[PDB]
Each structure stands twice: as structure tokens, then as C-alpha cells.
A paper describes a structure:
The Ufd1/Npl4/Cdc48 complex is a crucial component of ubiquitin-mediated protein metabolism as the universal segregase that removes targets marked with polyubiquitin from complexes and membranes. It is composed of the Ufd1/Npl4 dimer adaptor, which determines substrate specificity, and the Cdc48 hexamer, a AAA+ protein that couples adenosine triphosphate (ATP) hydrolysis to protein unfolding. S. cerevisiae Ufd1/Npl4/Cdc48 was prepared and incubated in the presence of 1S1UH-mEOS and ATP·Mg and analyzed by single-particle cryo-electron microscopy. More than 700k particles from three datasets were combined and segregated by 3D classification into three major classes of the Ufd1/Npl4/Cdc48 complex: no ubiquitin nor substrate-bound (“substrate-unbound”), bound to substrate prior to unfolding (“substrate-interacting”), or bound to substrate and unfolding a ubiquitin (“ubiquitin-unfolded”).
In substrate-interacting and ubiquitin-unfolded classes, all but one D1 domain is bound to ATP, while all D2 domains were bound to adenosine diphosphate (ADP). While the atomic models built for substrate-interacting states only had ubiquitin in UBS1-A (intA, intB), analysis of the EM density for substrate-interacting state intC suggests that ubiquitin can occupy UBS1-B prior to ubiquitin unfolding. Resolved interactions with a distal K48-linked ubiquitin bound to UBS3 (models uD and intB) involve an Npl4 helix composed of two conserved glutamates followed by mostly aliphatic residues. The conserved glutamate Glu557 is positioned within hydrogen bonding distance of the backbone amide of Ala46 in ubiquitin, while Leu561 interacts with the hydrophobic patch of ubiquitin around Ile44 of the most distal ubiquitin of the K48-linked ubiquitin chain observed in our structures. In addition to interactions with the UBS3 helix, contacts also emanate from an Npl4 loop between residues 514 to 518 and include hydrophobic contacts between Phe517 and ubiquitin Ile44 as well as polar contacts between Asn518 and the ubiquitin backbone at amino acid 47. Structural differences were not observed between states that did or did not have density for ubiquitin at UBS3, so we posit that in addition to ubiquitin interactions with the Ufd1 UT3 domain, UBS2 and UBS3 interactions with tandem K48-linked ubiquitin molecules anchor the chain at positions distal to the substrate while proximal ubiquitin proteins are unfolded. Other major differences observed between resolved substrate-interacting and ubiquitin-unfolded classes are the orientation of the tower relative to Cdc48 and the positioning of Npl4 residues 437 to 451, which forms a loop atop the Cdc48 central pore where substrate enters the hexamer during unfolding. In unbound and substrate-bound states, this loop is positioned over the central pore where it could clash with substrate as its being unfolded.
Numbering used by the authors:
A (entry chain H): 230 to 258, 281 to 310
B (entry chain C): 33 to 277
C (entry chain G): 107 to 580
D (entry chain L): 301 to 376
E (entry chain K): 201 to 276
F (entry chain J): 101 to 173
The structure:
């Protein structure tokens, strides 16, 4: 389904935008992968987000 | 004034002290007054005052249990002070001495304590002892805990918790801490040095503030092993009444 | 205080403390001694023996056993000290007032009031051992919520604690009912204003206490549907993936810090809240298996001084930066390698949260034992805040639900309909019933020997008015 | 047969009457000794809406049984 | 006589009126201080659908009496 | 006029409407504000359905009152 990466609270907090910025993270004047570096993703008190990309088992 | 002479009391009550009429007049006491009595080793107790002209002026009579609790002997001097702010014991938890209770069947509370506290209003403080003589038996107990702390009057409505495991008697004797200076001899000089170096900073701190100096803190005792260093330290700590650690 | 602290705590703690838990052992074949006299292998096994736990497939040591271990390790009787409290909750916040000659932290610090380096390490003792759901309906309705709406959920779970014989000095939290606060659930996550939640939960918990319950955790569902013909769900939480992402860990730590467990063996009097968090994700297959977790004590005292924030990596938690009013020392997390040597790795940019968790064992009551459920209910009067779905509490549903039973009699049938948690809460909300009348109502609905109390209740004019208005109302 | 009847408040009275006797007889007796018409009286046992049209034998009652009486008062 | 009157929402008001006074008087007072025609006013108590034509002494309502208010349309 | 409503999300929303109109007017106002047509909207006041075939005057809605909104397909 679309919500496994692109759904409600995925557009409110542009997880894709944050991911791309973290990948190309510099002042300097689309796919998400877990090979790179993390970036701070702070949300106020009382908010949960389960939209992180799935990985499935190891098979 | 309040340095009343110790004497053996005729009555067997554990919270009754008989005083002379002259001393009662001097201290403005009256019959039935609950007073705080201090003896030796900083031991304190609460005793109900009863006028008694038989004793010589300046003398008071207390029973064996009270003297044992106060750690004092007959003929000594005890200081008696008013205790008007004593509240009724909301809840007293008390346990017996195992050896005393051996061979007793049934509820000990009803047998001994129920007649002992009802219509008695006996003041009780933690660490005290009271003995009940019932039928052909005599059993001692301990004031394990009192609410409010640390002491209070056991009224008719006061709740008493006698439930709990027996307390071994060996602990009180074989653990004979609170050893006073009388348990150390042959080393009066060093004992005096430690006393003058420890008591005054703790017992009378205002002295050094008046003189405006910082009293010495560290102390280091040394000598051949087996000369009672630990005993001297324990005795000084117990007499000073400080929080020994 | 010249000894152990004096305070009154839960009955479970008292009864557990009374026991010693020693596991007896018989004459081993390797002993060399007569019948009497035990040498080294015949001695009773202490309850904290790690070998027994790891040999019986138990990953943690039943906190009370840990307390026994700590007490035995020190505090000799009759001498050697004047009692030192064995348990102390770690605190990382910088002492705002040390003053060896320096000024407060904002513009001055010494080496005596500098938070030393924190060594993260997996905790070894779990406070609450077994979380137990009384009946399958309690969670079946919760999952039915997601089934109907498709969005996630979140709800506190009230209940009570008790012994747990299956583990040495273990505790189990039996959950009785689930209450759903007003929240804005969504496909990928859920949101809820904290102020409203706490304000509502204060009164709800007051009523629950009146009923004899207690708030003992939070449960939320993280479920996604698979492409199979039937209802199957992916297993996004396994060894490789994240068991609990950063944000849920943070929320659980806050909740624990705000539900302290009163204990007699600490200077402050509290230690390691007995709060359990349950998450529904689905097992390796398509099932809807549940799970339980509890954040360790260090994480409990770590989030209070901020110092942690969520990270785009689900399995790692970001670390904040130093600033006035918030001093963050270097954080070393300690792990073990395949060669049996502990390795300290500095992880400032981000570190996994696997070191801040302890796992509990979920389960259900044996289906061949006595039934002590408080409420034979939870399939009836719709739960509180299901506004998003069609369920809605109001007079009409009461008329449809609890009118014909009362209008005639058959008190045996009535009792079960009156022992529904949400029904009691709603009728109390109406405020129609008088205080004492409601008190006897709850005493009849949550206790046995209820015949006389139920008859008295139906006698009281309050119930007559209730039934009359209910019948009159459409 | 010996039995015990407790009103809603808790006041208790011991009655003697045969098990085969119809409960209407006991209700009339309660009316006579309390002036409470049977319509206001309502007797319950183990959550059963006992009515004047039945006998204790049908309900299977025995001696020293506790019967809870409730006043369906006629003052409203 | 002092009495409580509670509305559907939860508001309660303490009123004074003689028990011998007809309930119509209290309903009219409610109309005065609320502007609610008595037909919409249904006063209830102890499972008694009180009608405007009665008086409290008939219902035996005494001091410190709380009576609930509902509407006859379909409920509150 | 000023009334408060508990929406599906659970928060509180204040709406303004003259108290001499059919409830369908309030339903239209709320749906226009948020985008939830009045076909499935249902309003509950003090735990009682408010049928669309009546205004607020008959119910005599008190000011600063509370309504609750639910959906049903
Ligand atoms: N006045 C005293 N001087 C020295 N030793 C004494 C005295 N009175 C008793 N003793 C005994 O001498 C021993 C003193 O032990 P001590 O040397 O203090 O122990 P430690 O090895 O800890 O210093 C104890 O057995 C004690 O009972
Ligand atoms: Zn052996
Ligand atoms: Zn400092």
C-alpha cells in the first residue's frame, strides 16, 4: 500500500524531504534507503509515527 | 532542684514514679503528672508523678524495670522535667521476649496487655520495657514502635499490635553497645583527649563561633593491636549521642 | 533514619518481601559428607542465581529477587553500619548548586558537580514480569476498532498486580478493562493533545480507584494489512528491524517517570515505576500477536533531562547538544562481542535503543481455572470515545441495551449487564445517581455476594428515575 | 416449615409454612402482620421474580430459606 | 419548602414553595425563570411522571427534595 | 450563536449559527468548514439525537452548549 512510506503524517512531516536533505546534507549556497546517516527527527510531546519504511523479515 | 535521688519503688507499675512532697513543691509538680525523666547514657523515660511523703526530701522512687531502662542504679541522680505536650498513642506495636513467653497458650494480648492498658493511660516510649504479672506468670515486653513517635500515651481507644515473631533476649545482652566511659579503664589520658577533642565541637558548637575559629576535624588514633581503640571510639560515640556511622 | 525507611506500599511488595524464595536442592552425587552437613552443591539456591534463570529460559530476574541480592550483598546486622539505602534511582541532571567556590552552571562549573560519563547497558531486572489479559474480548474489541476504521488506536489499560508463581518472586499485572482517550488516529500514526488526555484521565482514574482498579499501562496497535486473501499483517518488528522506534520509547519513559512505584528501600521512596507498555505488531506469520516491553531505569532518568530525540532511522535515537540548563555528557553504550569481551563504543550521532528495553511475557489466564474477572462484560454498551466510528454513547443506546432486562426482573441476567466498565462510567457521568447510590452500584457490580445490594439499588429512587426516564426517552 | 424473610432495609422475621403452600398465602400473612398489600410486596429468592401465582415447592424452597421482600409501594 | 431542581444538562437550582402548593406552581416558576412552556416541562422524581395538575403533598415531596427535569418530545 | 462541538478527531470546535434555523443549517456549516457532507453527519446533545426536521428553538438549546458529531454511512 501507499501508506508504507507515503501516507498521512508522512506529508505533514516531509520524511522524504528530511531523508533527501540528510543524504545531501550541506548548506550548499526520489527514494529513501537505510544506507546513509541518520538525521534528527523531533516531534512534540504526544505524537507517534509508524510510517518508517518496512524491511520485511530475513527470509 | 531536679536532681532527685533514685530509690526502689513499692509499686510494680512500669510508668509510675513517687516523689517527695517538698521536691514536688519545689518543682511545682502534682499527682498524675507525666514527666520526662533522664538518667545516664542520655536515657529518657516518661513517668507518672505521684506524691509520696515517705521518701526524704529530694528523693524519688522508681521500680526495677524503669531503672533497668534508664541504665542507672539505686542511689543515683535523675533529672525530672515537665512533659505536658505528650499526645495519645495512635497505634503501638509491641512484641514480647521469647524466653518469657515460653509455656504460654492462648492470646497473650488478652491475658496480659488488655487489663494492663485499659483505664491505665500508661505513657510508652520506644526502647522501653514493661512487665505484666498475670496469674502465676510474669512476662516482659518491649515498646517496639509508637505512633505518634517517639512516645505517646496508651489510651483506652489506642490500638495495640501484638502480632509478630518473638524477640530473642540474647540480642540485648550480647550486643551490649552504648558502653559508657565506665567500661574503659587504664587509659584516662587518651580518653580525656578524645573527649575534649570531640564532645566540645559537637555538644557545644557555639563556643567556637564565639571564639571564631574552625575546630580541628580529623583525628587519628594508633597503638598496638588489642588496646581497645575500637572500644574507646564506640564509647565516645555513644556518650556524645551523635549519629555514629 | 537509623534503619530502613518507614512507608506503606502495595500489598504485593509486602508479601513478596516476607518470602525468601530459596530453591532447595537435594544431595548431589558428587558430595562427600554424611547425611547431615551440606558442603557446596547441596546448599539452597538463592533466588537471584543467574544460572537458574538463563537455564530455564528467563531473561530477567524478577526485581524483588534483585532487591534480595542487594540486601544480602551488604548491610550486616548488629554492626558495620547504620543502614545505607541499597536502591537509588540514577539522576543525570547537573547539580544547579554545588558552590565549592564556583558559581552556578550557566557561568561556572567544577569537577565535583560535572555529570560523569554515562555507560548505557541493558538492565538485568524487570519490575513487572507477566502482563495478563483476563479475556480475549478485551483486546478483540480493541483490534475490531482498527478493523472497522483502518486507523491505529491507543488506550490505557487499568488493572491490578499480584504474585506470579511461575517465576522466582515474580509479579503479574492483570488488566481488567481498556479506556480509549480522545485521540486523532491516522494511517501512519496517531496524535492527541496531552492537556485534554491528562485532564480526562485524572477523573477517569479517580472513578477507577473508587471501583478498585488502577492505571497500569498503555497499549497501541501498529498493524498493516498484507496482500494475502485473508487478513494477514507484516512483521515489521523483528530482530533485524526495530522492536520499538525512538518516539514510543520516549513516551514510555515519560509515562514511567510520571507513575512512580513507592518503595521502602530508597532515600526518595520511589524506584522504577511498575508500568508496562504493550504493542500489537504481528508475529513472523500473518497473525496479530501482541508484545510487551518496559524501558530500563536509566532511560527513565535519561529522558527527564531531555538528552534524547527521535531519528529518521527507526532503530536509533538521536542525541541532543549541550546548552544552558541542559548538560549532556558523553554517552558510551556497552555491548558484548562473540569473543566474550565487553566493548565500549562512543555513539554520539545516534545509538540503538536495544539497550534501553526489557521484554515481558504476555499471556492469557488458563481456561480450566476459577474465574475471578471483575467484569463479565465488554461486549455491549459501546466504549467511550469511538466518535470516529458509528459507536456513540447516549440515551437511545441505553434504551436499546439495558431496558427490557430491568423492566421485568431476572436479576441473574441483570447482574452481568450491570458489571460493564464503560456502562458504569457512563451512568456516573450522567450524574443522575446519588453518590452513595453509585457507590453501592459499583460494589454490586464489581463484587460477589451482591443479591442484597442489587435489591437495595433497584429499590433506591435514583434507579427508579433512571429507568423511568430511559423508558420515556425514545 | 421454618423460613426467614428479610425486608429491603434488613429487618428479619421468621415464618412457619409448608413448602407446598402457595406463596400467595405467605404474602397474605405478611400483609396481615404488616398491613402491606401483596401488590406492594414482592418476594425474591436467588434472583427469581417470585409471584403470588406460584408455590414454594415449584421454586424448590426449603427450611430456613432467606427470602428478600421489596416494597412496590402504592404511594406514588 | 426548599427543594432542588436539576435539569438534563446538570444545572441545579434551589427553589422554595409550599408542599400543599400545586406542582403547576413550580412548573410555572420554572417557565418564568427559564422561559420553557410547561408542556415541554416534565418534572420527574422517584420514577413518578408528575403532571401539572397535582400538588407535592400528593407526591409527599418534602424539604430538601431534588426533582429532575425532562422533555416529553422524545426525551431530554 | 456560539456553540461548542466535539468532532470525530476529539478536539473542541466553536461554531456560530443563529438559533432560529433547521439543524441542517448547522450541519451544512460544519461540513463546509471541514468537508464532511451532512448525509452521514449526526448530532447528539446531552445524549439525544437531534433530527434534522426541527430547529434549535424547540429543543431550546442553551448558549455555550455542547454538541457531539458522529458519522454513519
Ligand atoms: N580498657 C580497655 N583497654 C583495652 N582493651 C580493653 C579494655 N576493656 C576491654 N578491652 C578488651 O580489649 C579488646 C580491645 O579490642 P580492640 O583492640 O579495640 O579491637 P580492634 O582490633 O578493632 O582495635 C576487646 O576484646 C575488649 O573487650
Ligand atoms: Zn554436599
Ligand atoms: Zn561544583
Amino acid at each position: 500500500p501507499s501508506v508504507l512510506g507515503q501516507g498521512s503524517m508522512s506529508t505533514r512531516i516531509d520524511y522524504a524531504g528530511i531523508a533527501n536533505s540528510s543524504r545531501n546534507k550541506l548548506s550548499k549556497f526520489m527514494k529513501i534507503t537505510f544506507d546513509g546517516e541518520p538525521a534528527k527527527l523531533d516531534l512534540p510531546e504526544g505524537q507517534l509515527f509508524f510510517g518508517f519504511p518496512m524491511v520485511l523479515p530475513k527470509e | 532542684d531536679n536532681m532527685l535521688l533514685v530509690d526502689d519503688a513499692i509499686n510494680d507499675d512500669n510508668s509510675v514514679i513517687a516523689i517527695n512532697s517538698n521536691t514536688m513543691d519545689k518543682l511545682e509538680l502534682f499527682r498524675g503528672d507525666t514527666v520526662l525523666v533522664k538518667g545516664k547514657k542520655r536515657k529518657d523515660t516518661v513517668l507518672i508523678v505521684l506524691i509520696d511523703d515517705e521518701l526524704e526530701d529530694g528523693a524519688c522512687r522508681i521500680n526495677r524495670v524503669v531503672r533497668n531502662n534508664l541504665r542507672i542504679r539505686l542511689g543515683d541522680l535523675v533529672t525530672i522535667h515537665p512533659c505536658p505536650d505528650i499526645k495519645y498513642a495512635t497505634r503501638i506495636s509491641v512484641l514480647p521476649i521469647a524466653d518469657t513467653i515460653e509455656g504460654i497458650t492462648g492470646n497473650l494480648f488478652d491475658v496480659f496487655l488488655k487489663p494492663y492498658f485499659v483505664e491505665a493511660y500508661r505513657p510508652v516510649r520506644k526502647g522501653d520495657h514493661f512487665v505484666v504479672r498475670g496469674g502465676m506468670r510474669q512476662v516482659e515486653f518491649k515498646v517496639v514502635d509508637v505512633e505518634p513517635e517517639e512516645y505517646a500515651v496508651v489510651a483506652q481507644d489506642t490500638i495495640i499490635h501484638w502480632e509478630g515473631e518473638p524477640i530473642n533476649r540474647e540480642d540485648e545482652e550480647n550486643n551490649m553497645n552504648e558502653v559508657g566511659y565506665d567500661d574503659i579503664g587504664g587509659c584516662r589520658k587518651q580518653m580525656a583527649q578524645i573527649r575534649e577533642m570531640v564532645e566540645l565541637p559537637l555538644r557545644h558548637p557555639q563556643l567556637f563561633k564565639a571564639i571564631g575559629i574552625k575546630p580541628p576535624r580529623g583525628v587519628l588514633m594508633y597503638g598496638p593491636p588489642g588496646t581497645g581503640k575500637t572500644l574507646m571510639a564506640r564509647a565516645v560515640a555513644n556518650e556524645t549521642g551523635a549519629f555514629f556511622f | 533514619r537509623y534503619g530502613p525507611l518507614r512507608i506503606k506500599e502495595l500489598a504485593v511488595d509486602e508479601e513478596l518481601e516476607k518470602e525468601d524464595g530459596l530453591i532447595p536442592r537435594q544431595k548431589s552425587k558428587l558430595c562427600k559428607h554424611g547425611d547431615r552437613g551440606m558442603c557446596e552443591y547441596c546448599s539452597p539456591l538463592p533466588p537471584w542465581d543467574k544460572e537458574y534463570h538463563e537455564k530455564n529460559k528467563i531473561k530477567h530476574i524478577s526485581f524483588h529477587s534483585y532487591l534480595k541480592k542487594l540486601n544480602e550483598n551488604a548491610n550486616k546486622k548488629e554492626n558495620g553500619s547504620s543502614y545505607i539505602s541499597p536502591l537509588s534511582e540514577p539522576d543525570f541532571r547537573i547539580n544547579k548548586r554545588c558552590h565549592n567556590g564556583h558559581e552556578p552552571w550557566p557561568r561556572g562549573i567544577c569537577s565535583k558537580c560535572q555529570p560523569s560519563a554515562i555507560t548505557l547497558q541493558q538492565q538485568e531486572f524487570r519490575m513487572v514480569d507477566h502482563v495478563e489479559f483476563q479475556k480475549s474480548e478485551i483486546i478483540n474489541e480493541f483490534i475490531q476498532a482498527w478493523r472497522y476504521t483502518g486507523m491505529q488506536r491507543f488506550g490505557y489499560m487499568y488493572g491490578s498486580y499480584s504474585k506470579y508463581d511461575n517465576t522466582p518472586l515474580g509479579i503479574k499485572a492483570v488488566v481488567e478493562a481498556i479506556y480509549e482517550p480522545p485521540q486523532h488516529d491516522e494511517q501512519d500514526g496517531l496524535t492527541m493533545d496531552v492537556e485534554q488526555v491528562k485532564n480526562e484521565m485524572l477523573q477517569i482514574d479517580r472513578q477507577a480507584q473508587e471501583m478498585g482498579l488502577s492505571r497500569i499501562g498503555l497499549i497501541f496497535t501498529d498493524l498493516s494489512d498484507a496482500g494475502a486473501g485473508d487478513g494477514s499483517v507484516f512483521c515489521k518488528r523483528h530482530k533485524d528491524s526495530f522492536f520499538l522506534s525512538s518516539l514510543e520509547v520516549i513516551m514510555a519513559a515519560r509515562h514511567q517517570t510520571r507513575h512512580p512505584n513507592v518503595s521502602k528501600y530508597s532515600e526518595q521512596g520511589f524506584f522504577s515505576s511498575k508500568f508496562v507498555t504493550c504493542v500489537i505488531s504481528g508475529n513472523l506469520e500473518g497473525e496479530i500477536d501482541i508484545s510487551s516491553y518496559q524501558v530500563s531505569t536509566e532511560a527513565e532518568a535519561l529522558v527527564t533531562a531531555d538528552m534524547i530525540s527521535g531519528s529518521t532511522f527507526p532503530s536509533m535515537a538521536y542525541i541532543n547538544d549541550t546548552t544552558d540548563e541542559r548538560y549532556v555528557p558523553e554517552i558510551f553504550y556497552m555491548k558484548s562481542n562473540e569473543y566474550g569481551i565487553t566493548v565500549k563504543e562512543n555513539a554520539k550521532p545516534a545509538f540503538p535503543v536495544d539497550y534501553l528495553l526489557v521484554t515481558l511475557t504476555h499471556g492469557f489466564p488458563n481456561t480450566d481455572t476459577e474465574t475471578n474477572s471483575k467484569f463479565v462484560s465488554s461486549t455491549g454498551f459501546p466504549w467511550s470515545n469511538r466518535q470516529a466510528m458509528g459507536q456513540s454513547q447516549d440515551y437511545q443506546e441505553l434504551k436499546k441495551y439495558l431496558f427490557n432486562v430491568a423492566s421485568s426482573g431476572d436479576f441473574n441476567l441483570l447482574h452481568e449487564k450491570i458489571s460493564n466498565f464503560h456502562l458504569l462510567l457512563y451512568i456516573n457521568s450522567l450524574q443522575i445517581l446519588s453518590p452513595d447510590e453509585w457507590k453501592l452500584l459499583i460494589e454490586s457490580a464489581v463484587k460477589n455476594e451482591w443479591e442484597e445490594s442489587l435489591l437495595k439499588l433497584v429499590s433506591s429512587a435514583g434507579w427508579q428515575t433512571l429507568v423511568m426516564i430511559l423508558q420515556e426517552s425514545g | 416449615m421454618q423460613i426467614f424473610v428479610k425486608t429491603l432495609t434488613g429487618k428479619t422475621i421468621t415464618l412457619e409454612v409448608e413448602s407446598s403452600d402457595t406463596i400467595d398465602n405467605v404474602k397474605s400473612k405478611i400483609q396481615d402482620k404488616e398491613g402491606i398489600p401483596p401488590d406492594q410486596q414482592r418476594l425474591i429468592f436467588a434472583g427469581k421474580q417470585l409471584e403470588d401465582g406460584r408455590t414454594l415447592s415449584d421454586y424448590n424452597i426449603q427450611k430456613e430459606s432467606t427470602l428478600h421482600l421489596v416494597l412496590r409501594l402504592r404511594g406514588g
